[PDB]
Design a protein around this ligand. Structure first.
Ligand SMILES: C[C@@H](Oc1ccc(Oc2cnc3cc(Cl)ccc3n2)cc1)C(=O)O
Ligand SMILES: C[C@@H](Oc1ccc(Oc2cnc3cc(Cl)ccc3n2)cc1)C(=O)O
Lengths: 424, 426
């Protein structure tokens, strides 16, 4: 059989022997079917790369729409397998219309049933926008469109594999397990650099929080690299993680990271998936040139996403969190479920040196130039002794609890478990 | 510092003698008040630029939050007047928390009561992000936002800024009703505004203004951002409507990343407040960034599909000259549940232009043809393709256009469809 055969593709995705066609096979360019993915009833459709290179037509789109109606009715996840040059030129406006009806079905399904796209071949035009409307896009390398693909697989087979795991993440979310959280506790603080000025990759910290032999399904690893987001399991339960990554742009927020974070927050909130927000961010940045439009607009959207969120969302401040960025990273003012801080964490308007340069500008300016750098450092030291600490923020109430980093897992799990499924 | 006195500014904005302060005056850096705007009960607050440059602190932010709670409780529009360098740094994290609570209030109000910002001075940091969370930002030129599409309306001066601020609350809060007699009395031959040649570019704005009431301003949003797309509020037979229109004068009228984003936000705004939409379509395609980055147009375009697809206010489409391909689907097509789709007689609804279509469908015959005859062949191939594809009659047959109309009744036909639609569904 040709490798592009849609029944072959469907069969490699679904549980063995579970495939049930939803319609008679034809020359429409689409084959849709029901089946199971590790037991859970799932709907899927596959564009047929053997007919007109998978081009989307009236009858094909109609099968997709029927599959969507079926999935919506049964509340089943729906998975599309894509390989298609786009709309069938010969079918004219009729095909355009039919493609649009696919979009409208996906929009009706949005936030109601999970939608996973597995792009296994070239996908252009309507076949690029189709996946763009779904919740998670898995791409095989054999298939610039920056930020559109969430997960890059090794090949086609690995792509169905990640696709299958995603069905489990969304449809078998499970329960938190306090005993497993404690059993996985480690000293996560040890993963930080000795110097508080040195940059590090946050991912080992994310990995240490999540269950040990469970994959971290990171989204968009190569887009907006100053932000890390993705799905995993914490004591068996599906969680989404967001984490500033000091390794890139000093972990600062900017237009694309804010966009990446906001979309991820909205996706998890839509499906009842609780969030862990690992914060270590000194500030935020404009684009090339000094354009602030993006980070203002996207930043606002980030605020909106956390603000309206109802799933549990717990913040952990590892090292430092400053200013407006502090506010946007799931702060108490935006109704965070709980905010924890490691012992040596700093929560402040800005660095003590910068703070002092502003608060004592005139004293510093009026001081003799030779006594000045010493005066600045002395004032900073005294500022730092009364402002910035965890104990100050505790006092104000914007940090709920300072925690031993050896208890990060259990503490996080405990806070998430005590929150309602929906409120805040 | 008299001119930046908040009471003065609040008084310059509200109807004369309607100011009722919501709290004792102080040095918190904000003053909040209730009042009227052409009789509509309105809540407002002004940052106090005479105190530490309007810097935002715990007490001031608290007044803003109580103002929001009052507006939300009484379902009143709320207007912020902004002049602030940022947060009261000496308050430390306390100030950060307080500014966040302002954001959180704006979020609670989002889509529930109209929020209008009037930026009259330097607005930085938190004072930049606050207005970004509201629905319409008006900016006086004697000012600057800092920490691009963030400003929707640029006024002539501070008083002009208050005047537009005031008109805006009228658009949101006194939306009125459609009026057939007035719609018809304003009918003109709108098609006459197009060039003779279907290949010439033109500014779509006179077409929009021809549709809207003759003696009523068209409040265009973001005129200098995403210029291939025009959006804005105006009145149609006295009724507040939103207008979206591709503008052929810029980038051929093509969709792209920021035009899709501009359109999507505007759709969601009108949908939130029960404001019906007129979509004027003349779009031949869509574009990547000039570096060939398609990411934006894909992500933002999908957001436009979503905005129209979920929309429940009435929304009617008018195809004037052409609508092609994927851009056709996105511009409030029947497949996304458009309320009604009108087309002018010579309009084209198609996958692409006939010349382009044939060039693909018959690439081989064309390339085989002798060089001095390949042009006559291309043209005869095109003419026969458009005998059978692309016209309004065909589109009527398929069902993607509901009615071909005489352009001289454009304004009244649009009014009729919007007026007779359910206020919610589709
Ligand atoms: C000290 C500083 O205080 C600020 C600065 C900004 C601010 O508000 C926001 C809001 N959303 C943001 C979102 C992102 Cl992605 C980044 C930064 C953001 N900042 C709130 C307080 C200032 O006033 O000078
Ligand atoms: C012939 C052509 O047909 C298309 C192309 C694209 C398409 O889907 C969309 C969806 N949203 C869009 C949004 C915008 Cl702002 C622009 C273009 C958009 N296109 C649907 C059909 C193709 O398949 O090649």
């Amino acid at each position: 059989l040709d490798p592009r055969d849609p029944l072959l593709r469907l069969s490699n995705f679904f549980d063995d022997g579970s495939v049930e066609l939803l319609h008679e096979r034809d020359r429409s360019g689409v084959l849709a079917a029901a089946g199971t993915v590790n037991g859970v009833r799932t709907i899927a459709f596959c564009t047929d790369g053997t007919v007109m290179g998978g081009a989307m037509g009236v009858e094909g789109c109609t099968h997709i729409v029927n599959a969507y109606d079926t999935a919506i009715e049964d509340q089943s996840p729906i998975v599309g397998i894509w390989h298609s040059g786009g709309a069938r030129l010969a079918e004219g406006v009729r095909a355009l219309h039919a493609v649009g009806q696919v979009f409208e079905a996906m929009i009706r399904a949005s936030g109601y049933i999970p939608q996973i796209s597995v792009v296994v071949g070239f996908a252009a035009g309507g076949a690029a926008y189709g996946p763009a409307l779904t919740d998670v896009v898995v791409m095989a390398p054999e298939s610039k469109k920056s930020g559109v693909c969430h997960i890059v697989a090794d090949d086609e087979l690995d792509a169905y594999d990640r696709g299958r795991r995603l069905v489990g993440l969304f449809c078998q979310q499970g329960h938190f397990d306090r005993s497993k959280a404690e059993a996985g506790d480690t000293d996560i603080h040890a993963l930080l650099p000795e110097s508080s000025r040195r940059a590090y990759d946050v991912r080992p910290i994310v990995t240490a929080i999540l269950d040990a032999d469970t994959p971290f399904d990171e989204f968009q690893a190569n887009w907006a690299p100053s932000m890390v987001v993705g799905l995993g399991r914490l004591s068996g339960r599906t969680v989404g993680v967001l984490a500033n990554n000091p390794l890139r742009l000093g972990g600062c927020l900017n237009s694309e990271s804010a966009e990446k974070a906001a979309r991820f927050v909205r996706l998890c909130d839509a499906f009842g998936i609780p969030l862990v927000v690992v914060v270590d961010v000194p500030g935020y940045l404009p684009g090339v040139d000094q354009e602030w439009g993006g980070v203002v607009r996207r930043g606002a959207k980030l605020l909106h996403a956390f603000g309206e969120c109802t799933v549990p969302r717990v913040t952990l401040v590892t090292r430092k969190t400053y200013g407006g960025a502090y506010i946007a990273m799931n702060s108490r003012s935006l109704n965070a479920t709980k905010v924890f801080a490691w012992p040596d964490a700093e929560v402040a308007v800005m660095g003590a040196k910068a703070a002092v340069g502003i608060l004592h500008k005139k004293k510093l300016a009026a001081a003799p130039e030779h006594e000045r750098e010493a005066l600045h450092d002395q004032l900073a030291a005294e500022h730092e002794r009364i402002a910035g600490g965890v104990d100050s923020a505790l006092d104000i109430g914007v940090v709920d609890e300072k925690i031993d980093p050896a208890h990060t897992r259990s503490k996080l799990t405990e806070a998430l478990a005590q929150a309602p499924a929906r409120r805040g």
